[PDB]
C-alpha cells in the first residue's frame, strides 16, 4: 500500500501505517552547502548521524476548545541532544528538517488539523508600541499556544487564529508546505523542509528559520465514553546539519 512509510535517520526510526505521502517543501531535498555558495572560509564540522536523527518535543493535549500551537525552530531543539550542543559552540549553522507530526485517534473520533511550516513567521504584539518579549515567542520544547479570541497583554504575542498571529488570513496558510491530519484518513504528516534563508548559514540562536504551526480547522469531537485525551506529538529530525565558526560555549 501507500499508507506505510518508514524514515530512518541516524539511529532513530519512525514508522506509520496511515500516512499521506511526504511533502518536500518547495521541491528541494536538504543537502550540504556547495562550494559555489559558500562564504565562510574554514572547515565546517558535519556531525552527520550524531545530530541527524529524530528528537521528540513535548506532547500537547488536543482539547475540544484548543485553538492551535506553534514551535519556533531551531529554538525548540536548543536543549535536545547533541544538536543543541553544536549551536552553543558555533556561530553558524544550517540544517534542513523532517518534521513529523503524529496524532492517532479512533474511527469514532473526528477532527482536522493543518500542519504547516511557515518560514520567517514574524509574530505581532498585543500592544502596537511594543515588540514581543522572548519568553512569549518561544517555550523551547513546550509549545506556545494560540487563543480563540483576541488577547490583550502588553508584551504578549497577539494570538488569535483568524490572523494566525501574523495578521494574514488563517485559511491562506497553504502556499507554505503543509499537510492535513484528518482523523478519518491519515494520522501523521511529514514535511521535509530544506534550509530556507537569504544567507548561506546563519546563527542558530539569534534567528529562527521557520515556525511550525498546528491549527485545528475542525474541532475534536467524540461521543462521551470514548477516550477524552488524545495528544499531538511532534518529532523533528535535522537533516544535513553542518556548523561552522567554532567558539566558546554560550549564547550571551
Amino acid at each position: 500500500s501507500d499508507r506505510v512509510r518508514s524514515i530512518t535517520l541516524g539511529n532513530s526510526t519512525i514508522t506509520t501505517q496511515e500516512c499521506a505521502n511526504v511533502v518536500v517543501g518547495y521541491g528541494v531535498w536538504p543537502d550540504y552547502l556547495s562550494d559555489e555558495e559558500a562564504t565562510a572560509e574554514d572547515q565546517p564540522t558535519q556531525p552527520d548521524v550524531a545530530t541527524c536523527r529524530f528528537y521528540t518535543l513535548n506532547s500537547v493535549k488536543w482539547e475540544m476548545q484548543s485553538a492551535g500551537w506553534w514551535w519556533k525552530f531551531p529554538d525548540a531543539l536548543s536543549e535536545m541532544g547533541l544538536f543543541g550542543q553544536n549551536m552553543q559552540y558555533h556561530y553558524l549553522g544550517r540544517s534542513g528538517y523532517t518534521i513529523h507530526v503524529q496524532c492517532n485517534a479512533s474511527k469514532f473520533h473526528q477532527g482536522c488539523l493543518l500542519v504547516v511550516c511557515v518560514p520567517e513567521a514574524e509574530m505581532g504584539c498585543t500592544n502596537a508600541e511594543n515588540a514581543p518579549t522572548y519568553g512569549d515567542l518561544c517555550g523551547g520544547e513546550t509549545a506556545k499556544q494560540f487563543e480563540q479570541n483576541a488577547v490583550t497583554g502588553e508584551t504578549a504575542v497577539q494570538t488569535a487564529v483568524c490572523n494566525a498571529g501574523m495578521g494574514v488570513g488563517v485559511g491562506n496558510l497553504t502556499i507554505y508546505p503543509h499537510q492535513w491530519i484528518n482523523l478519518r484518513t491519515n494520522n501523521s504528516a511529514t514535511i521535509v523542509m530544506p534550509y530556507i534563508n537569504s544567507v548561506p548559514m546563519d546563527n542558530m540562536f539569534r534567528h529562527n528559520n521557520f515556525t511550525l504551526m498546528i491549527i485545528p480547522f475542525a474541532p475534536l469531537d467524540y461521543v462521551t465514553g470514548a477516550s477524552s485525551y488524545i495528544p499531538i506529538t511532534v518529532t523533528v529530525a535535522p537533516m544535513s546539519a553542518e556548523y561552522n565558526g567554532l567558539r566558546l560555549a554560550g549564547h550571551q
Partner: protein, 59 residues
C-alpha cells in the same frame, strides 16, 4: 554469567502515545515478548548448567 566488567545494557519500553480504544472494547490489553538470536550469534566453551540438581541417584 553476570559480571560487572562486561555488562550488557538495559531494555526498556515506554508509551510513545497511549492505547486508545473505543467504548465497547476493553481498556486493558497485553504485550508479550519473544526472544531469539540473530544469525550472527555464537557461543563458546561448555560448562554444566546450574538449573538442575539432585541429592542422589533417581531410583
Amino acid at each position: 554469567v553476570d559480571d560487572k566488567y562486561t555488562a550488557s545494557g538495559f531494555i526498556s519500553c515506554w508509551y510513545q502515545t497511549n492505547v486508545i480504544v473505543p467504548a465497547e472494547a476493553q481498556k486493558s490489553c497485553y504485550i508479550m515478548c519473544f526472544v531469539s538470536a540473530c544469525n550472527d550469534f555464537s557461543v563458546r566453551m561448555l560448562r554444566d548448567t546450574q538449573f538442575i540438581k539432585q541429592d542422589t541417584f533417581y531410583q
